[PDB]
Amino acid sequence: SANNPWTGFQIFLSPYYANEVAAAAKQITDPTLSSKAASVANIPTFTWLDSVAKIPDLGTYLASASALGKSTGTKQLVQIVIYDLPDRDCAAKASNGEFSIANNGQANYENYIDQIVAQIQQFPDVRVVAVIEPDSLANLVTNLNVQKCANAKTTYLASVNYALTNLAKVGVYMYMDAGHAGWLGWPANLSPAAQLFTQVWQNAGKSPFIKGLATNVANYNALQAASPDPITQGNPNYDEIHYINALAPLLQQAGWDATFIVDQGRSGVQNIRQQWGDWCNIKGAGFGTRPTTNTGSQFIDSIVWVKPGGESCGTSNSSSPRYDSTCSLPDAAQPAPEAGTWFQAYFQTLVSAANPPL
Numbered sequence: 001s002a003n004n005p006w007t008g009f010q011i012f013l014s015p016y017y018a019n020e021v022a023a024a025a026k027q028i029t030d031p032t033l034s035s036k037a038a039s040v041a042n043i044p045t046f047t048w049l050d051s052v053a054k055i056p057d058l059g060t061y062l063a064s065a066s067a068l069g070k071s072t073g074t075k076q077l078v079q080i081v082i083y084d085l086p087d088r089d090c091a092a093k094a095s096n097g098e099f100s101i102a103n104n105g106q107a108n109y110e111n112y113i114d115q116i117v118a119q120i121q122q123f124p125d126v127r128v129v130a131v132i133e134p135d136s137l138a139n140l141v142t143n144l145n146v147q148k149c150a151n152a153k154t155t156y157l158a159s160v161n162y163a164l165t166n167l168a169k170v171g172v173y174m175y176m177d178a179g180h181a182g183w184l185g186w187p188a189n190l191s192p193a194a195q196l197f198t199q200v201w202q203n204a205g206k207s208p209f210i211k212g213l214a215t216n217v218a219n220y221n222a223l224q225a226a227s228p229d230p231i232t233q234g235n236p237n238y239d240e241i242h243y244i245n246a247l248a249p250l251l252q253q254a255g256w257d258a259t260f261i262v263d264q265g266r267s268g269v270q271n272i273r274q275q276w277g278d279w280c281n282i283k284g285a286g287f288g289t290r291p292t293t294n295t296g297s298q299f300i301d302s303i304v305w306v307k308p309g310g311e312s313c314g315t316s317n318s319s320s321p322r323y324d325s326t327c328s329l330p331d332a333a334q335p336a337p338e339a340g341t342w343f344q345a346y347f348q349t350l351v352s353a354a355n356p357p358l
């Protein structure tokens with residue numbers, strides 16, 4: 001649309017991902033590969049506010065971005081993920097979320113939002129783009145027969161509404177997570193998804209700051225594939241562009257001129273999954289298309305790197321309390337460390353298999 005959040009702004013690079021990458025690159029032995037790995041710290045990515053413990057980090061990024069903009073004559077933009085719902089990841093075998101519905105989880109989540117808003121409010125010369133709650137609303141389209149999801153539904157909707165309503169008050173541009181082509185892009189899922197997202201947008205007052213939806217977050221789908229990945233058989237929407245081209249008109253019909261962002265951070269290598277639903281640490285993944293507003297789609301504001309490649313999606317250790325068995329499938333790189341922690345061998349392959357090359 002007319003207002004693409006990224007136009008006219010310089011993205012603030014994550015110093016934390018930058019710190020992870022710098023430490024990772026010096027351990028890569030081939031000198032040509034190590035220098036390519038180091039350059040990954042210059043590629044814009046999203047900061048995951050996966051716990052209240054991450055909020056102080058957010059505050060430093062806003063203030064730093066503000067100072068960098070003044071030092072360079074630029075307007076700065078900070079990219080974040082809101083990812084702390086109570087009973088988070090309701091359909092997963094295991095979740096790392098710190099809040100539970102049964103222990104005032106919604107109230108604790110709303111205080112988490114309040115703390116984030118209180119940071120953002122202090123730095124009005126820094127633009128913020130937020131992805132809202134990966135692995136939440138999508139579960140409420142297709143996974144209502146999972147008891148935890150049925151039991152989480154009202155809390156997910158209330159908590160996401162609180163996030164949208166209150167982040168809008170400080171001018172945050174927001175994209176609700178909307179799964180990916182293999183999740184909500186099945187033709188039969190497009191209408192229930194649109195109905196849910198539209199109800200969410202309406203409950204939050206149709207704020208213009210609610211730009212639309214984020215897709216492929218932490219996944220591996222192509223934006224545009226010349227040949228469908230065999231995992232996609234039965235779904236004519238075999239890539240993200242097909243999914244977005246199908247869903248967007250349903251949102252527009254409701255009066256929401258929605259736009260989209262698409263994660264491509266681990267999409268450089270296609271045809272690496274046995275089944276489409278295999279999501280954990282998929283072996284052989286490569287860094288994908290670099291972030292850009294040159295998307296070639298009327299509906300897509302930016303290609304982005306939301307999931308930071310190299311941070312594990314979960315342990316393959318079946319004895320860990322956080323073990324998700326998806327992370328031990330044959331197509332999951334193993335052994336793998338606990339979710340969020342650095343997975344050095346995975347990062348090195350992401351670098352080696354990057355497409356376009358680094």
Ligand SMILES: *[C@@H]1O[C@H](CO)[C@@H](O[C@@H]2O[C@H](CO)[C@@H](O[C@H]3O[C@H](CO)[C@@H](O)[C@H](O)[C@@H]3O)[C@H](O)[C@H]2NC(C)=O)[C@H](O)[C@H]1NC(C)=O
Binds near residue numbers: 318321
């Ligand atoms: C795979 O899963 C296990 C994690 O649940 C882990 O085994 C456990 O590792 C911890 C850390 O060594 C041990 O807990 C220790 O905690 C205190 C430290 O303050 C020590 O004083 C205790 O002696 C205790 O050892 C657990 O005992 C241990 N549990 C078992 C059954 O072995 C494995 O290490 C994990 N393996 C990998 C590769 O990740």
Ligand SMILES: OC[C@H]1O[C@@H](O[C@H]2[C@H](O)[C@@H](O)[C@H](O)O[C@@H]2CO)[C@H](O)[C@@H](O)[C@@H]1O
Binds near residue numbers: 092135276279
């Ligand atoms: O896309 C990353 C995201 O996947 C989640 O699992 C989805 C999966 O993407 C989808 O293909 C399948 O159809 O449904 C599952 C949920 O049942 C996963 O739970 C997340 O941890 C992950 O971030």
Ligand SMILES: OC[C@H]1O[C@@H](O)[C@H](O)[C@@H](O)[C@@H]1O
Binds near residue numbers: 124126127128171
């Ligand atoms: O989105 C960020 C923008 O929000 C506006 O309210 C501020 O006045 C601008 O300085 C800032 O660049």
